[PDB]
Design a protein around this ligand. Structure first.
Ligand code: MG
Ligand code: MG
Ligand code: MG
Ligand code: MG
Ligand code: MG
Ligand code: MG
Ligand code: MG
Ligand code: MG
Ligand code: MG
Ligand code: MG
Ligand code: MG
Ligand code: MG
Ligand code: MG
Ligand code: MG
Ligand code: MG
Ligand code: MG
Ligand code: MG
Ligand code: MG
Ligand code: MG
Ligand code: MG
Ligand code: MG
Ligand code: MG
Ligand code: MG
Ligand code: MG
Ligand code: MG
Ligand code: MG
Ligand code: MG
Ligand code: MG
Ligand code: MG
Ligand code: MG
Ligand code: MG
Ligand code: MG
Ligand code: MG
Ligand code: MG
Ligand code: MG
Lengths: 98, 68, 223, 43, 102
RNA sequence: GGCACCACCAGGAGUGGAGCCUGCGGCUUAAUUUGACUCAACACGGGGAAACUCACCAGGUCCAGACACAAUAAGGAUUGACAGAUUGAGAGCUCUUUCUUGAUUUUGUGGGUGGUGGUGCAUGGCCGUUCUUAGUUGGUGGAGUGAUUUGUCUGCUUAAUUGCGAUAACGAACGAGACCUUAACCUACUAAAUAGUGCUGCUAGCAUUUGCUGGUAUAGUCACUUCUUAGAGGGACUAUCGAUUUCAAGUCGAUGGAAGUUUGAGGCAAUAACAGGUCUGUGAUGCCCUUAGACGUUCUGGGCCGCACGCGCGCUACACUGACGGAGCCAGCGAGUAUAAGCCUUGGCCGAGAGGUCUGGGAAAUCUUGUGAAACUCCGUCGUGCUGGGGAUAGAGCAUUGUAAUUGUUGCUCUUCAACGAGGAAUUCCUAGUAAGCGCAAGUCAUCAGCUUGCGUUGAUUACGUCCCUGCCCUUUGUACACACCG
């Protein structure tokens, strides 16, 4: 897929810091309402990430549920050239409740 | 037809062998008695059981009945 | 926005139906039984019942935290407006959903059907079920497909009580040669029911004879 | 299980699976730096 | 903004919890000397959907007839606004939704 | 032997005969996509297709071919592109044309991925059918070496293997019945300004007797729950009395009753089974096929409607128990929206109509709505005549929906005014608020309902019996069948 580097970037800082992404299955949608780029870009950009074992993908009721692997946090640790302060938000150890 | 079933026929004749002195020939009195004697899940079965018990009671006074 | 009463109660049901299937697909490996949506002021409490509440609440509750985020981003909910709790099912043997998912994880491991089928027959009865019947249909090495029923104990079939004391779960099992369909019908004991009727409609319980006392002619006991 | 065997060893092997699990399961119950800040500290 | 004529609208699919919440509010509006009007049983609405049984189009023409009963009750209270809202939290039920209109 | 209006008897309405609607075969076709062929294929795939739907046909785009490699590659791997040509097209599709972007990406290898592509005779699930008929099963005991058998039956009775009863059986389970939903009763409870009423304020018209019809009334800060709504209950259990009967299960009459056909109607529904139908419901599937000149997907246009014919579900009718023309004027089941992508729409004003316009109400017991529906009833015209029955076919014209109406979407106006004068052999549905008419609402739906799913208005004739036909069940029997006569 041909994604501009800048638009692919916004796709990467949404799949990090809130390391889960939800995308409705419509390829011609102008705006996925949470990543200011084409909706098709979001699907195909994360299809590569799940293709390279960085996100699990689940599909239910014409909707994509993307979740970031622990191995994928390390990939964005280096490729994004970001500080080594990790834990996007769903990994911040907010701890459950009993 | 109005053929009573086995769940009402056998359950009614157990009452007579167990509570004959308290029973009577009146359906209305019998209907109230069986609500405190048996645990019936539905109101319709309660009247059905008492209505056949009354028939058996009405038949016992004319002679001996089979199964009681 | 402004939604009619007819269209609002349906939306809550449709939301439940879509949310329930989402857990079945995602938490299939953890014996997902069901979900309860407890609406409350300033919060949307969601109670999920699974055999294993460690797979959902694993590695400092990372998965459940990363799983509630997938629902805020799909239903446009406020991040504080929803709270998810994972609760263990008390009687795992009485849940046909847990028993059907457990059977699939065994059938997919190559275990023989007879050993797998009898593993849920005895597990259901051990938990105290009144009856259980398991049907497995599909193809196994043979080109022709077949179905086998494994009953046990007492089972009711017709009328309303089947909607009250019986829960059912069907799942499709993905095999290398096709699809295996399993049906797990479990009838719970009506005496333990805590919300509906506590007995079958035709169960008549006659009390015992309180008679056989001795009557004395005619005294008066004063107080 | 189309044999007189492997269903014999399906029940005795199947039932010992449950007996091991009811007791195991009845024991299981009786004994019961952030990120967005790093994106704003560019002052 | 003190004592007002206040409407609470109760809608749900199941009547047992609806009458418990309805009776519980009436109970709390009795020991508290608050004049009340209700509950008013609105005519229940039967949402019916009739589909074909066959996923395909083969067999006898057999139909399912699904139903979704909606029961709606409105209760009128004469109390200050602070009192009525806290009553709602006393009688909160997952099945029944509540809307309050002045 | 037994049961059954998907069987018959007595009958009712019919269909088959006509025109037209629609489905099927056939023919035709550039394609007229396809499944289904007795019941259990043929107004069925919720399949009422202008585009989409769409799978077909004639053409035109895109990759939305992830990923590991290898090649190429900054001295630029590649993407977008004005203008002209080309094209159906203001598709940079392609061709002249040099601009722009920059390692996302181009080629080969593997690997994918997507298919309304094939296989429902490889499968899951679902559904239909045997069959909603009344059938099925185990414990102990008896018989047998055994597989098995009795129990599960001569008779009566029931809607019913449902009961009485006979009894090497006794006592039980599933199914049936129980159960659940709905309709009919409650002046007995609980309340209701989103329901109704009497009074009461204020107020109108007509005769004046103080009466009779109304409007108004969300402050009359009234009264009440019969009508309306719905929750807790009550109420029918064949109750009482006559007959028959093995005096048993029951059945038929009366009386009371709201209800005495399981009170009426449904929902659920056993043990197994079918090569029944669906991979054209599924991001349900195994395998096969295809995968860049696609069988993916998209755009444009056509087709699914195409017409010498056979068949099925239906709608109008053939008139006077009627057509028109005025007038009277009564239901129930339901549905309804927002920054949309536009819902139900009263009321006012235009218009012969269809329809248009301006406001307002309603996310609804509040408004549309008492949905003032149609049959129906009254009074007239017509007068047995292919007539004022019938309204195809067609010409000209007016509106609506939609990007788009041509192969007329639908509606309206004038005109043309066809077969049909009650239908052969055959054949369907049906027993009481039933059949038949008669409309209305919901589903499909931008538009289109001669279709279904329901609802109510008017409302019968004739049995309440049988095995004569037909189908199914049971018992006995024969068997060289057991993949079970498709043997
Ligand atoms: Mg039963
Ligand atoms: Mg039943
Ligand atoms: Mg006939
Ligand atoms: Mg006849
Ligand atoms: Mg006709
Ligand atoms: Mg088309
Ligand atoms: Mg097209
Ligand atoms: Mg075609
Ligand atoms: Mg295709
Ligand atoms: Mg099948
Ligand atoms: Mg035996
Ligand atoms: Mg024996
Ligand atoms: Mg039986
Ligand atoms: Mg039963
Ligand atoms: Mg008022
Ligand atoms: Mg007045
Ligand atoms: Mg009934
Ligand atoms: Mg088949
Ligand atoms: Mg076949
Ligand atoms: Mg398919
Ligand atoms: Mg498919
Ligand atoms: Mg579909
Ligand atoms: Mg193509
Ligand atoms: Mg067609
Ligand atoms: Mg044509
Ligand atoms: Mg039909
Ligand atoms: Mg007239
Ligand atoms: Mg109204
Ligand atoms: Mg005409
Ligand atoms: Mg004429
Ligand atoms: Mg016939
Ligand atoms: Mg059309
Ligand atoms: Mg319609
Ligand atoms: Mg149709
Ligand atoms: Mg033989």
């Amino acid at each position: 897929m041909l994604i501009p580097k800048e638009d692919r970037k916004k796709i990467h800082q949404y799949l990090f810091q809130e390391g889960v992404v939800v995308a409705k299955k419509d390829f011609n949608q102008p705006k996925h309402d949470e990543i200011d780029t084409r909706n098709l870009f979001v699907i195909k950009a994360l299809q590569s990430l799940t293709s390279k074992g960085y996100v699990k993908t689940q599909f239910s009721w014409q909707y994509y549920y993307y979740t970031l692997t622990d191995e994928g946090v390390e990939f964005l640790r280096t490729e994004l050239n970001i500080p080594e302060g990790i834990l996007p938000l769903t990994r911040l150890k907010n701890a459950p409740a009993e | 037809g109005r053929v009573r079933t086995k769940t009402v026929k056998r359950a009614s004749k157990v009452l007579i062998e167990r509570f004959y002195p308290k029973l009577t020939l009146d359906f209305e009195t019998n209907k109230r008695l069986t609500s405190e004697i048996a645990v019936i899940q539905s109101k319709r079965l309660r009247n059905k059981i008492a209505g056949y018990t009354t028939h058996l009671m009405k038949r016992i006074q004319k002679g001996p009945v089979r199964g009681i | 926005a402004i939604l009619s009463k007819k269209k609002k109660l349906v939306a809550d049901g449709v939301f439940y139906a879509e949310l329930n299937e989402f857990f079945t697909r995602e938490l299939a490996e953890q014996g997902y039984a069901g979900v309860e949506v407890r609406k409350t002021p300033s919060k949307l409490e969601v109670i999920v019942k699974a055999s294993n509440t460690q797979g959902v609440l694993g590695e400092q509750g990372r998965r459940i935290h990363e799983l509630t985020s997938l629902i805020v981003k799909r239903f446009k909910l406020s991040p504080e407006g929803i709270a998810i709790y994972a609760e263990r099912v008390e009687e795992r043997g009485l849940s046909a959903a847990v028993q059907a998912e457990a059977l699939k994880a065994k059938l997919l491991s190559g275990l023989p059907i007879r050993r797998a089928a009898y593993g849920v027959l005895r597990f259901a009865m051990g938990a105290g079920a009144k009856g259980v019947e398991v049907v497995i249909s599909g193809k196994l090495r043979a080109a022709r497909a077949k179905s086998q029923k494994y009953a046990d104990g007492f089972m009711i079939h017709s009328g309303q009580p089947t909607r009250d004391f019986i829960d059912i779960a069907i799942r499709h099992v993905l095999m290398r040669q096709g699809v295996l369909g399993i049906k797990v019908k479990i009838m719970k004991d009506p005496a333990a029911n805590r919300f509906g009727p506590r007995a079958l409609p035709d169960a008549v319980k006659i009390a015992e004879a309180k008679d056989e006392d001795e009557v004395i002619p005619a005294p008066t006991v004063k107080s | 299980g189309q044999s007189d065997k492997r269903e014999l060893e399906g029940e005795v092997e199947g039932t010992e699976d449950a007996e091991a699990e009811l007791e195991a399961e009845a024991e299981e119950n009786d004994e019961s730096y952030l990120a967005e800040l790093e994106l704003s500290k560019q002052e | 903004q003190q004592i007002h004529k206040i409407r609470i609208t109760l809608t749900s699919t199941k009547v047992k919890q609806l009458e418990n919440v309805s009776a519980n509010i009436i109970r709390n509006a009795a020991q508290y000397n608050i004049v009340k009007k209700g509950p008013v049983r609105m005519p229940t609405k039967v949402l019916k959907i009739t589909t074909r049984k066959t996923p395909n189009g083969e067999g006898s023409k057999t139909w399912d007839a699904y139903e979704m009963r909606i029961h709606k009750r409105v209760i009128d209270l004469q109390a200050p606004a602070s009192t009525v809202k806290r009553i709602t939290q006393i009688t909160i039920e997952p099945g029944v939704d509540v809307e309050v209109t002045i």
